[PDB]
Design a protein around this ligand. Sequence first.
Ligand code: P4A
Length: 207
Amino acid sequence: VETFAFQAEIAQLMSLIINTFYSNKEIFLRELISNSSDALDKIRYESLTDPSKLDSGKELHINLIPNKQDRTLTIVDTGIGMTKADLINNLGTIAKSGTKAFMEALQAGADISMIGQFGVGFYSAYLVAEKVTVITKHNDDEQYAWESSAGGSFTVRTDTGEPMGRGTKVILHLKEDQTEYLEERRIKEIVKKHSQFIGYPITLFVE
Ligand SMILES: COc1ccc(-c2c(-c3ccc(O)cc3O)n[nH]c2C)cc1
């Protein structure tokens, strides 16, 4: 298990998301689905000139898996996934510069719902999750598990869990007062409100 410190600016971003009074938390789902859509666009584009890029799985889709017993909401995609290096380097985001631009915008009237315009929408997971686990598999690397409960550090380990072929799995260990995001009608509502034009099937699993 390797432990890393977040860059000062990323720890600042996470503290802002955790500590700012902001009721519109439901946008975390749109943000994570948007990242899933971007990763699926990436593998689809590569496959247009190289069909073997899909040897690790042809289906391009998103699964939403609530689990009331574990108090987890899992978002699975069959996108391009990430290398260990990209996972350590702020989960493939330009988080340092993105955070700076987002901070300036917040002082210029913007609100947390606009986080995605600054390329750091992944970190909106901390509006609803006390801990986030990211399992990822890229065609050019092994399967890795990234994890953080914020507090300035994250861990990276080789994943021993279920192999996923190719893509990214975001496991949201929800805060006790955020369990509405495990309810079928609530998830359906949010998907319809903010992710209705996503170009990949979104399957909402039942329990
Ligand atoms: C906007 O920046 C980014 C940065 C990285 C990605 C990304 C993800 C991913 C990352 C997070 C996630 O929730 C789901 C995913 O498939 N997987 N692979 C890539 C290249 C997507 C958007």
